[PDB]
Amino acid sequence: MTERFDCHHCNESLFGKKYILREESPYCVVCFETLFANTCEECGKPIGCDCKDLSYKDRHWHEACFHCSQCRNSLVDKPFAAKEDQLLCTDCYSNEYS
């Protein structure tokens, strides 16, 4: 115990798990993720790397959150019409966009 083993940021003892030295200082796993994690425009919560972080057009999305508003199909790396707050299939989008 010569050195200190606490998240230099939350100062909470690292919880039963490995840790990252951030700012030359131990940070709890969560810190590293929450700090640089991306926000899921669908959930609004940071997307940790411990999950499928879908990245499309400098934006981020849970591979499960990215879907069509009508077919609820999971559009990923697939063509989609980006609506103001929704995503649709170029088939459904062209159905209303018309």
Q: Which residue has the tokens 């115990």?
A: 1
Residue 31 binds Zn ion, judged by CB under 5 A: yes
Exposure string of 8-22, with b = 16+ CB inside 10 Å and e = fewer, is bbeeeebeeeebeeb
- Residue 36 CB: number of other CB atoms within 10 A? 11
**The only residue of 7, 54, 81, 87 in contact with Zn ion, by rule CB under 5 A:** 7
Per-residue binding letters, 47-66, with Zn ion (x by CB under 5 A):
---------------x--x-
Total residues contacting Zn ion by CB under 5 A comes to 15
Contacts of 29 (CB under 8 A, 6+ apart): 17, 18, 19, 20
Q: Which is nearer to Zn ion, 37 or 40 (CB)?
A: 40
Report, in Å, the least distance between residue 49 CB and Zn ion: 14
The residues of the shown chain that bind Zn ion, judged by CB under 5 A, are 7, 9-10, 28, 31, 40, 42-43, 62, 65, 68, 70-71, 89, 92
